């Protein structure tokens, strides 16, 4: 991302559970539930030591989330030019048109689309 993009203050992802993907602000460790699951599972004087990262897990999450939040509601419009106000349902309509699928699927099945992503997550 050119600059870290804010995750919008209004989580209008069309009913999608992005709160499981993006960092949880209420925790001392700013990680998402997906991240907590992985981080809890993936784990001297003899001269061999390990140096710290520059970008900490939270800092990586900030760059990652900027890219991710952009991807779901605005695509690359927060990069190549000023940001575009595409509401999530229109971003999705364009998302389907872009793969050769009619936009009618989004509107006619908006509720099933919302449920299939969330079910899979």
């Amino acid at each position: 991302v050119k600059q870290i993009y804010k995750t919008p203050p209004i989580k209008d992802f069309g009913g999608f559970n992005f709160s499981q993907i993006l960092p949880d602000p209420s925790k001392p460790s700013k990680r998402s539930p997906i991240e907590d699951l992985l981080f809890n599972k993936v784990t001297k004087f003899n001269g061999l030591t390990v140096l710290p990262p520059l970008l900490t897990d939270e800092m990586i999450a900030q760059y990652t989330s900027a890219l991710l939040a952009g991807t779901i509601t605005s695509g690359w419009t927060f990069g190549a030019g000023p940001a575009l106000q595409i509401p999530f349902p229109m971003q999705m309509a364009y998302r389907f048109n872009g793969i050769g699928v009619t936009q009618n699927v989004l509107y006619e099945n908006q509720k099933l689309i919302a449920n299939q992503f969330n079910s899979a997550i």
């Binding site: 991807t71 779901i72 389907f96 793969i99």
Partner: peptide
């Protein structure tokens, strides 16, 4: 992720619609 590639089954079987990255020790999810 920042796209929707038609590379065949590139990020998994099917046409890409979208993708989302997450942090991990030593990697990306």
């Amino acid at each position: 992720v920042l796209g929707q590639s038609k590379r065949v089954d590139f990020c998994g079987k099917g046409y890409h619609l979208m993708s989302f990255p997450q942090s991990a020790p030593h990697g990306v999810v």
